[PDB]
């Protein structure tokens, strides 16, 4: 009925490292490898529990050493790029001038490295956007969410532009007020 997963990874040669906890598919927290601190998915979690960020950095070091061992054992068998499935939706039924949020769902892909940008009428948007780290999947590929707070209108149109090695070309998911 419930699953808690401690998920971590290391990617060469990008030198990407991650460490996070998952509750029924939702992130509880992950560790900022540079600031060396626990980043809670929701603010209130950090007021009810704690975690020693330092501990994740120890695991990551072992994770990398093991990557090097495994890489060599497989005779340097590289990973096969699997392109993401991209979808765009609002978090709630859209209504003109009614505050909403655009969600760009990037799923079923690997390796865990993507470039995601939002476009308002063909132009890039930087204001108010936020994103999550890479989330684990049972098939061992990844998921990831990008958010854009906006004010619906018949005039504005959007696109979630995603780049990944498995995509020959950047993929653009369009969205516009229809309802």
């Amino acid at each position: 009925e419930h699953v808690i997963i401690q998920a971590e990874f290391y990617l060469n040669p990008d030198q990407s490292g991650e460490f996070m906890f998952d509750f029924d598919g939702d992130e509880i927290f992950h560790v900022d490898m540079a600031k060396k601190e626990t980043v809670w998915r929701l603010e209130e979690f950090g007021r009810f529990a704690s975690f020693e960020a330092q501990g994740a950095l120890a695991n990551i070091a072992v994770d990398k050493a093991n990557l090097e061992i495994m890489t060599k054992r497989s005779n340097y068998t590289p990973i096969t790029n699997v392109p993401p499935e991209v979808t765009v939706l609002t978090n709630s039924p859209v209504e003109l001038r009614e505050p909403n949020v655009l969600i760009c769902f990037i799923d079923k892909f690997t390796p865990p490295v993507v470039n995601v940008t939002w476009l308002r009428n063909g132009k890039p948007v930087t204001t108010g956007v936020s994103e999550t780290v890479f989330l684990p999947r049972e098939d061992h590929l990844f998921r990831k969410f990008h958010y854009l707070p906006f004010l619906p209108s018949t005039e504005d149109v959007y696109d979630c532009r995603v780049e990944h090695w498995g995509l020959d070309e950047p993929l653009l998911k369009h969205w516009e007020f229809d309802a």
Binding site: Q15, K36, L57, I60, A61, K64, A65
Partner: protein
């Protein structure tokens, strides 16, 4: 613009720290990593560089990792012939012979030295409760030197002559070291541990992240201290 000086409420008070001050002392009492003309040989995360430097002192490590504020800083020095000077730590030092960790502390070696082992003196003036008590100089073999190197040298001196840090607590309540550059720019570091019962050495040294360097022949240093009562 330059960083605004601290107000009493902006400073850590040793009276609010209940851990072992010896753990702060440990980082500046004849404690530092020093290497000349070396190039990085590895990297754990993109913002850090790993060098082959041996602890000639007590053979405690032969690999050193220094973390920088960002990837660009690391890229900048990755293939440079540099010099290294900084305060290292072991507790929570991780990366894939003994190992030790540190932050910043990197400077280009090319034409940054003085001929004939000449050292540059740097002025340090100490203030206790707003009055200049003692003044002296520390020295470096670099024209452009990291604030970290100078800071460490100043504190090493003050620990011996003024008991800046003792095993248990300190004679002072607050303290910050301020750097004045010839261009009028200034910045400072809090010399006391964050409040609480445990001193996180790694977190504290992170401030040296920016790898901030200054001109040794013209920079000026000021150490401002205060006792709890006066």
């Amino acid at each position: 613009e330059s960083q605004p000086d601290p107000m009493p409420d902006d400073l850590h008070k040793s009276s609010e720290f209940t851990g072992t001050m010896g753990n702060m002392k440990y980082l500046y009492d004849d404690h530092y990593v020093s290497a000349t003309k070396v190039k990085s040989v590895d990297s754990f995360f993109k913002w850090d560089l790993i060098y082959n430097i041996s602890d000639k002192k007590l053979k405690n490590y032969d690999k050193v990792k220094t973390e920088l504020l960002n990837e660009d800083l690391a890229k900048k020095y990755k293939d440079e012939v540099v010099d290294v000077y900084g305060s290292n730590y072991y507790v929570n030092c991780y990366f894939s012979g003994g190992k030790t960790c540190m932050y910043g502390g990197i400077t280009k070696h090319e034409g940054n030295h003085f001929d004939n082992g000449n050292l540059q003196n740097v002025l340090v003036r100490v203030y206790e409760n707003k009055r200049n008590t003692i003044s002296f100089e520390v020295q470096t073999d670099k024209k452009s030197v990291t604030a970290q190197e100078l800071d460490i040298k100043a504190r090493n001196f003050l620990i011996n002559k003024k008991n800046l840090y003792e095993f248990n607590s300190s004679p002072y309540e607050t303290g910050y070291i301020k750097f004045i550059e010839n261009n009028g720019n200034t910045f400072w570091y809090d010399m006391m541990p964050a409040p609480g019962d445990k001193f996180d050495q790694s977190k504290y040294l992170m401030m040296y992240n920016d790898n901030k360097t200054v001109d040794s022949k013209s920079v000026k240093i000021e150490v401002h201290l205060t006792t709890k009562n006066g």
